[PDB]
């Protein structure tokens, strides 16, 4: 299995690595139909999305979306440095693969 | 595929932003039959819901109203300053569809 | 659809509003079979359950249940004062149907 | 229903209490095969677990089982003091049924 | 029945304890499909993970592999210190059985 998230990114079609070393700068989340979504920014203006659950995913995908959300609000909150984040590059907000904290 | 709270809320009906840039004052939540919900207020008076799930909402948005409220309670407990609201107006208090969190 | 807590509570027969103010004394809480439910105390001693859920409750009810728990634990653990709690009071300890916090 | 962890302990067979007003010292957790468990120490060297789910627990205590986990390692991670412990002293370690913590 | 991590280690083939005594260095967690699972660091380059659930897993795991996600989450955003891992080292990086916690 992949030992960091740059090795877990190459993985997949349409991803690419963005390295911020922030903390995340706002949090969002809705409950409006079909847009049962977060979406993060950084201070340089970056804006990604948790995508809605939807036909693009796995069953076991779905559970991990739910701790995706999870792990950025409590990142935000609690202001940990993001240092990547492995993405989906042909969504806008780009889309959270994976995420990795450290410092 | 939202860029943010406002362009999210604009593409629904019966909505509204409310900017508040301040933490909550107050975090209400009950069990009552028929009144599992929560409250909040803000020191200005200003209050919101999130609604009792309902016919009004689709079984994706169920998921997403546990979430809501688990957000408020942690917002409220660690004095984060919500940035923004995304709310229908149809209701009293008015509804909660998004939050926004930012510094 | 109520505003507080003292409006909610009012809608139910055999209730009343207890204003602690105060910060949770103690938390107990048990996994014994019949009695999966938790207890809180306040310095005045002053004791509240919340529920073993049962045939009294409908099914909205069951993870608003769940959901009291989390939030009583959190509220102890963080020292936040509790301002309200709207509880059934033909049951002892009295049983917790609603709670507000603010400072 | 009972005023405290005292009285509820007395309500089953084969059950103590242990007082403790202390920190928890260790917290251990288990994801392997049928030894899907948590173990907790205090500094003076007494250990209790949260029994791995078996035969001998009826429905309702499963969700309660998972939630004394949740509330183990957060009060290991805060430091929170337990008053005390009800456990089973039928089995090795002794197992725990309910916890109590006040300041 | 175990009462510490080095013994309930050593009933299952396949595994070592690994000694950190230290926190976490990093933490990441990817919801991409077939590679839903979290990679922990340590400082000095040690690296483990929570395995994708799968059919080396029986029902019972289930629950306790998403539990440890959130463990290691938890103790890597408030710094607390691992003691040991129990791992299975027929895995690369090496899988986590089992974490123990402590000063």
Known sequence: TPQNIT????EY???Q???????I???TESLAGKREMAIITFKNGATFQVEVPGSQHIDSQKKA???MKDTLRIAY???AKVEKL???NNKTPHAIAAISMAN
């Open 65 to 67: 979306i739910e701790r």
């Open 7 to 10: 090795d877990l990114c190459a």
């Open 17 to 23: 690595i963005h390295t911020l070393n922030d903390k």
């Open 25 to 27: 700068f706002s949090y």
């Open 13 to 15: 079609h349409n991803t």
């Open 77 to 79: 909150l609690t202001e």
């Open 86 to 88: 492995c993405v989906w």
